[PDB]
Design a protein around this ligand. Structure first.
Ligand SMILES: [Zn+2]
Ligand SMILES: [Zn+2]
Length: 96
């Protein structure tokens, strides 16, 4: 295993992967987990906020400012995607 940076294999965000604590709520979407601080677009690094417009395509984070229009299934009369909320997912393993 090479991708394992999550103090083992409990849970981590694809942006940084620095431990998913039970204390810090994490943003979960289709089938992936992210940190509320790591919830930023990969184009302009705009933080996605619950109540603000964001884009989630192929498991990637974009924003209203970039708005990848060349490959957005549903980008018709203004896509209305809103950033999800952070909830507690899984605790990280701590090797004592
Ligand atoms: Zn993170
Ligand atoms: Zn952006």
């Amino acid at each position: 295993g090479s991708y394992i940076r999550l103090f083992g294999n409990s849970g981590a965000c694809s942006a940084c992967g620095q431990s998913i604590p039970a204390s810090e709520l994490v943003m979960r979407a289709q089938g992936n987990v992210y940190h509320l601080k790591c919830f930023t677009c990969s184009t302009c690094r705009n933080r996605l906020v619950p109540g603000d417009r964001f884009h989630y395509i192929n498991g990637s984070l974009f924003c209203e400012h970039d708005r990848p229009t060349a490959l957005i299934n549903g980008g018709s009369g203004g896509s209305g995607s809103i950033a999800p909320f952070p909830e507690a997912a899984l605790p990280t393993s701590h090797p004592k």
